[model samples]
Target chain A: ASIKVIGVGGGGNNAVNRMIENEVQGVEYIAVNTDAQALNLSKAEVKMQIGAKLTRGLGAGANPEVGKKAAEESKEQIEEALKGADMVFVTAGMGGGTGTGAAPVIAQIAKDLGALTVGVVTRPFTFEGRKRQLQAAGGISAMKEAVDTLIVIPNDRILEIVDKNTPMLEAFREADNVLRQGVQGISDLIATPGLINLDFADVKTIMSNKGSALMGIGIATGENRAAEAAKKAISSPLLEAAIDGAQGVLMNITGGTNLSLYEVQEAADIVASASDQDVNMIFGSVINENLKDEIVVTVIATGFLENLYFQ
Target chain B: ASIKVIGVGGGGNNAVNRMIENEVQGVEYIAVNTDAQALNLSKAEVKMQIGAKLTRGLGAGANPEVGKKAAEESKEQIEEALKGADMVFVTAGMGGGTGTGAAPVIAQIAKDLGALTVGVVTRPFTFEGRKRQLQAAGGISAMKEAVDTLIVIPNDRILEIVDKNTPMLEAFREADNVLRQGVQGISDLIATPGLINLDFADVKTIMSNKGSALMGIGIATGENRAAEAAKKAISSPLLEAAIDGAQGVLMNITGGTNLSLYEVQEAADIVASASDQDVNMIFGSVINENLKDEIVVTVIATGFLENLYFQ
Candidate 1:
């Protein structure tokens, strides 16, 4: 149940700030960046600045090596920040100095500490040109080795998903929401009690394959809500591609007391049917006694998809 | 070791046409499409015109339902086309007609016949509009259920990797190359005999988890080639993300007869170091007596990453 969400670099810091603004629940938020100004702006529960001699709290100057050095210099502080955590989720906007370099160092530290480390980061836009793309690609490779699971959101894709006239802040918000659901989905699954639980161990076992993993969330509040929720969850753009050949599937349902066992079974059945027949399916349900009709479906699917690693 | 590479729909037919021109080895090639003209254009050993009743040898007209119906009507033919295959790779460009609808049906038939079915397909460019994207997403989901593995190439990404001024044909050629490497990688691993011997069982065991899988290739000649090859193989852009927490790693070294044990060890060490320490590393080597010094390194790493599904 102990999880830490650490934001590395300025872009990561801003993402953490948005999470706080959105009132994300049941997780510790920490912001780690070489830039003191950006760290100061993050409303995370904890903040740390690194590399006094190199960057002097200004920034890493877009050099990942500098970011790596800064992180290495403050390894002790980073370890202290992650103390007693069972899982760590690192967030960053890669291609820039701090995020590209420090995020992996932090993730590696968390992994070394025996925590299941996951990274949620954004790659630079296509227009950012060759240099930024190169920077981000290298950073991505490093982070992929450092964390147990790496979730990358290509900024280029965000542009494609949004409208040309969309406000800058609003567009950024869309990117922020992608990260939010990822953090929130796992958080809710673990923090809340379910009749059939997929505890941290279950997740660890499924993820032990260290292959790519995906998470999705869906909600409904009416009749046939189970089927509707299941439909929404698996068809989630993020979960869509990875579901193929997924050997392992973990589904959790949170519903009011009115939720019947039949409804839960139906939801799980629909999702299982959506995956390959050989998929190993696990189901869990949490009943909230507060008297309501709404239900939420959360799914974590793991398997090999060639598209997972490529652009 | 018997593998059949089947291309489906117009896009797939064209891609298989390119592979035939390139003289790929150790695999049977088949092309299936609803349009007789497209099927005829493919240079595969086998060409199939499906949905004779639905399209009457015409085309699916970007309508997947018609494509699906056509495949259903011709299920026996599709099954006959896939008979006796141990592994079947269904390649297509999703979001239009035959690929969007029939690819999954073809995969399912192969699966039903007890052959492992894998899909390599494409998602349309964002500019292709919501309809195409929608068609692709649904098609992707169905294929996920039908196939043992689904590899998606986002058309939008091809634009980023290739130059803006590149000719459309050349750009599409680049996309074709991606699929070529993927099919070639797996085919080479299975078809060739290895010194250390990681047979089909090992691959099945490794891929059984069915989370995201990644493959990388590196080739070099002369002194220090093994280490250099491993370095390049693990660093391939396609492999950069999936190495994190990789539970199973299969590394193959295809070397000239001059290949030394020292060189093999060096290459394996480098590739192994690139993944999580706990990764189950399996190493194999093939000695090609005809070559003098050159070597090819192929690696398949399976593990979880958040962005494994999303673009």
Candidate 2:
């Protein structure tokens, strides 16, 4: 089975790239930044760099148009990335300039070329200011039309996971790490094998440049009577098989406010139910002060290749 | 009422500080950090800033001794924030560098100070890379004994909210925001008049700083039919309040690979039922790929307070 992942983003100073850097572990990332430290993170197996002048706009007047242009430029690179790839993930959308503008464009290109594009977007926190929310919302809207699956990760979700008293930075990293896990969970579900539907590897094989898919998952609390709702979520041979044999899996969970011991246990159970795997995979997530009822989970499973997993 | 907020963390980086910056928008946050940004984020409203260099590792590896020292420093500050405060929110454990390492030490400070602390945290993702999980687990275990409410945001829960196609940074932001909203919702519900609960401004006053309140919600789709389930979901006072108040609602629905259109419509109606003000606002959420039978509502009240209305 063959799989290709194109990281296209003009996120604020390559915020997506930075996110990738934080998660990639060993993938060599070629530093496009003239700054030597940026080069320190280069470790992607196949490193490639495209030029982009990153920027961010503050208020409504902040030009989303520039982001549109950046998206247009990144669109070419993404199409190229889609050529031989079984499944492609498009990551962008952020404050101000490049990422917000360019991500939508990349999604359009990916959609046009028929690649199974998964758009992972960071929705702005309105409290950060209405402008950022507006800009990020536009990017999300664009991806909504172009990508098969759109994952929205708000920065505030992590704080919900951590201790209310914990300092801000720590809470943020907590949120960031949670997002990474949700994504990788989906990746694994899409890429791995399960009891029912497609396996993780299947998604990549079945999906080429043209096929598109997006998945989502999150967590919130609910009535005590409906507490163990995870058991009823989406657990079936079909969904399990999709996780087991699909190309990749992406997952997102959200909870806080009134988090309880039983609730988190249910969340883990939910993940296990989705991948039809053991509960060991449930890593960390965000906590909060102001959270809705019940946790939210988003999972995107894509299938690529003819008989990628067919024996 | 009286309260205090205790923040237990280590890495004081952009992520953490950004969290602090964002949290201030909802409720007051007090924390522990190592990153300059983390320290600075809580700087203005910060009662105290405990200094530590390492991002994690409590002992010699994580600098536990230094963490203990930091706790002592923050202990005084926590008391200061606790002064005249009615409720308290305590945070720690991302399983990261500093927060994880310092949790136990800082926990003692809250216990001695006699503040009603609410511990919000994220349960780790998969067990694959669990060294940090164990570490954070230990911190949580220690802190659990001291905090009033242990609000844990499950990793998989946030994954559910992760829209596969959103940009990474935007995804992070969205996840963060959702989590924050969860907390705000809880704080509001207990402290302010919210959906199921009644009064708004009074609830707000209760959640202010010593706003020791937190909240959580969950989802379970299989137990009942969509329409019946939708009605049952809205029967709660919270949904009743939500139904009682609203401008216009449109639900954007997605997720559930085999989900049918009726389910989506039923979900939309849940929002419609929540706010008597208008059904339009309840109808605006988009249900697409990542959303199968899933439903999320973001309620925007008259004052422009964006409550993460959807669970």
Evaluated with lDDT, which candidate comes out highest?
1
Task: Give the best candidate by DockQ.
Answer: 1
Name the runs in model 2 displaced over 4 angstroms: A6-62, A190-197, A200-311, B1-311
What TM-score, computed on C-alpha atoms, does each candidate reach?
Answer: 0.50, 0.34
Task: List, residue by residue over A123-175, the lDDT tens digit for candidate 2.
Answer: 55455675676556555555655766655556654444457798765654544
Model 2 quality (TM-score): 0.34
Candidate 1 regions exceeding 4 Å error are A1-311, B125-130, B154-165, B193-197, B218-225, B252-264, B283-296, B303-311
Error of 2 at A164 (Å): 1.5
- TM-score: which candidate is best? 1
User: Residues A1-311, candidate 1, lDDT per residue (tens digit)?
Assistant: 78899988877777778778856656899988888887788798798989878899899999999999999999999999998899888988788899999899999999988898877777776676756876786787688768877666666656655688987777667766766656655666666655655678867665554445666667888898999998888876555354654657778787887888888899998888887776777777876665398888878776444342344
